[PDB]
Structure 1
Amino acid sequence: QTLRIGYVSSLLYGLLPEIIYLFRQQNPEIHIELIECGTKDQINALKQGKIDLGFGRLKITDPAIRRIVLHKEQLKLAIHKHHHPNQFAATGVHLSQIIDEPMLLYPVSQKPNFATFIQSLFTELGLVPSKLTEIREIQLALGLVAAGEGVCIVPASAMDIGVKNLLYIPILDDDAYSPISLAVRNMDHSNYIPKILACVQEVFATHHIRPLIE
């Protein structure tokens, strides 16, 4: 049997690869195909049987799809380490403090996506970012911050991406988090679902994190 798992790349800096690695060692018989797939696109891919599991980073719902929320990652503002030493405290900023700053969004894809999500955080607060640029993928955006192209809001795990000379400052607003979720077809009764969820639990426990399931 072949298990097709959709994922977004920003999740590769967190616990997901560990989870897949553990699943694989526990289930060596199963052939695993990892497939890069945007969060919205995972819905249709699941429906059409092109993937069996979808790991995504923003909330999208569908009646045919069960969304299993694993964890909420706090958002951070990535800045060049010498950018605004006084007005951007290391203890954190509110989104209201950064509307004047050149801001990098990601990815470049058909919307809705993480770029529209981040924009919505401002919109629901009645804030308007003054300059937005859409960048292909998160790692590029962080590279461009270091090169002097402004600021970029990222999930906590992106703090470890190896771009030099950055600081990652907490975003203080309540709604500023990215949910890590696992999507599956509602009428899929395969044993790989409880098996992968068991692996999620083992890895989270290893790291002293309680997942939002159980």
Structure 2
Amino acid sequence: MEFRQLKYFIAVAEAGNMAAAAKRLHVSQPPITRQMQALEADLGVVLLERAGHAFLEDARRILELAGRSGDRSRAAARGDVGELSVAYFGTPIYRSLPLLLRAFLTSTPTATVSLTHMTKDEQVEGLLAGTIHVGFSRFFPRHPGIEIVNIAQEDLYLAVHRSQSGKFGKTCKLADLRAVELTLFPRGGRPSFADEVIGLFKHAGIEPRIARVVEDATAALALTMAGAASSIVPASVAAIRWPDIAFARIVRVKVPISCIFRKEKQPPILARFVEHVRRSAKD
């Protein structure tokens, strides 16, 4: 079986004659009878004569998917349809990353996403291999073939129990915070949030008081919700109305958002994300 025999058969069916369709497609009569006579051999039955209803219901359905299939394969390359395998790590989940995907899904409504938790490292392997598309965290070291895109900057906020709201007012700076018993995060991750918080202190001269380092951002505020600790978080987390906790920005003391992706052989839906995240960067 081949394609010409199916369009012929449909044309011969709609025209009711092996010559009325021969003009409906602009070719002489011998080939009309040359291919349907050969069509009834690629099948075995006698469709028409000087089972035909059974093979017609299929032939119009074989070409229908053929045209529709071409419109999928092309639109797939245009990145209009496709699942984005997003990987993440840490603080930008609470507010940052969700707004970036929902804004990207407004940009490309047919696309879907799949979240896969991964450390800043397992992203690099996951990107250099092709398991994931983008990896979200804050502090990424360079890697010979991975490009970073710094999107924006977040403020850092002190978290404290509501009982001690007035003890630090609305907002206070970094030096006001030498005796605060900061309990940071995360335990996992070789140089992540806490390590850079410690860094912004030494660059500011104050050696920080740190009592414990817990697993999550939500584990440091868990201790704060019980008054058993005080922590410091990005503006993403402080945007959430956390019960029993009070927040205060810290006043050259920002941390960034950065997605990482492989620079070679980029899938289309990934490049449509890169398009939306770069236009969303400078704005």
**TM-score range normalised by the length of the shorter chain:** 0.7 to 0.9
Partner of residue 212, structure 1: 281
Q: Quick one: distance in 2 between partners of 1:105 and 1:145?
A: 11
Residue 55 of structure 1 is aligned with which of 100, 123, 136? 136
Query: 3-state DSSP class of the match of 2:115?
Result: strand
Paired residues of 2:151 and 2:278 also in contact (CA < 8 A): no
In structure 2, runs of 5+ residues without a counterpart are 1-81
1:154 aligns to 2:223 (yes or no): no
Report deviation, 1:93: 1.9
Partner of residue 169, structure 2: 89
In structure 1, runs of 5+ residues without a counterpart are 203-210
Q: Quick one: distance in 2 between partners of 1:190 and 1:48?
A: 13
Report deviation, 1:24: 4.8
Q: Quick one: distance in 2 between partners of 1:125 and 1:140?
A: 26
Paired residues of 1:59 and 1:179 also in contact (CA < 8 A): no
Q: Quick one: distance in 2 between partners of 1:136 and 1:162?
A: 21
Greater share of helix: 2
Report deviation, 1:165: 2.0
Greater length-normalized contact order (CA 8 Å, ≥ 6 residues apart): 1
Partner of residue 209, structure 2: 130
Q: Quick one: distance in 1 between partners of 2:175 and 2:215?
A: 25
Residue 100 of structure 1 is aligned with which of 161, 179, 199? 179
Partner of residue 51, structure 2: none
Deviation string, structure 1 residues 129-168 (Cα, Å, up to 9, x no partner) = 2333111101121121121122211111111335312211
Residue 141 of structure 1 is aligned with which of 220, 243, 246? 220
Q: Quick one: distance in 1 between partners of 2:166 and 2:103?
A: 42
Partner of residue 268, structure 2: 191
Paired residues of 2:86 and 2:115 also in contact (CA < 8 A): yes
TM-score (norm 2): 0.63
Number of residue equivalences: 201
Residue 152 of structure 2 is aligned with which of 67, 71, 92? 71
After TM superposition, what 4+ stretches of structure 1 lie above 4 angstroms from structure 2? 22-25
Task: Give the fraction of aligned pairs with identical amino acids, expressed as a percent.
Answer: 24
Q: Quick one: distance in 1 between partners of 2:254 and 2:131?
A: 29
Partner of residue 55, structure 2: none
Query: 3-state DSSP class of the match of 1:95?
Result: coil
Report deviation, 1:198: 4.0
Instruction: Write the letter of the residue equivalent to 1:16.
Output: L
Q: Quick one: distance in 1 between partners of 2:160 and 2:222?
A: 11
Deviation string, structure 1 residues 99-144 (Cα, Å, up to 9, x no partner) = 2211111111141111212111112223212333111101121121
TM-score (norm 1): 0.81
1:182 aligns to 2:182 (yes or no): no
Residue 42 of structure 1 is aligned with which of 123, 127, 134? 123
Larger radius of gyration: 2
